[PDB]
Amino acid sequence: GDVAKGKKTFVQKCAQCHTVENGGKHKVGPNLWGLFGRKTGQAEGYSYTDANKSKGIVWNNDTLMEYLENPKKYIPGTKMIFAGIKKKGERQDLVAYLKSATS
Numbered sequence: 001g002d003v004a005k006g007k008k009t010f011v012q013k014c015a016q017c018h019t020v021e022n023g024g025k026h027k028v029g030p031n032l033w034g035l036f037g038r039k040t041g042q043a044e045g046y047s048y049t050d051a052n053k054s055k056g057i058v059w060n061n062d063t064l065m066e067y068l069e070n071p072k073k074y075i076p077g078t079k080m081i082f083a084g085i086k087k088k089g090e091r092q093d094l095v096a097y098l099k100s101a102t103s
């Protein structure tokens with residue numbers, strides 16, 4: 001996806017609850033550094049719900065694309081209160097940015 005477009009999407013819809021940089025602070029949600037290739041709920045020092053921690057899947061392009069379309073559907077009981085990015089293209093660009101900004 002388009003990294004530049006994904007960045008603006010992140011700033012507009014995710015930034016209020018997330019940071020992505022290495023050593024980033026946890027806000028409403030956990031810092032996202034190192035997300036790809038890691039199982040759900042593994043950000044150091046963040047208090048996740050049992051649901052996010054128990055999902056047991058590995059975050060990557062395919063799981064992030066599904067999750068971001070409807071967070072609560074993928075992880076019922078999650079405390080991430082966000083409806084999701086409905087457009088696939090917008091979601092793909094966001095994932096592209098996430099991959100670039102989190103490593």
Ligand code: HEC
Binds near residue numbers: 040042043068081
């Ligand atoms: C606050 C109102 C939020 C907004 C807007 C977004 N997210 Fe979030 N996110 C939030 C919380 C409180 C949590 C933890 C949920 C829990 O049940 O513990 C999360 C979690 C995520 C995750 C999973 C992280 C992990 O498993 O380590 C991802 C990948 C994530 N959030 C992504 C994300 C994106 C890309 C957003 C914008 C579209 C976004 N979130 C917004 C709270 C909030």
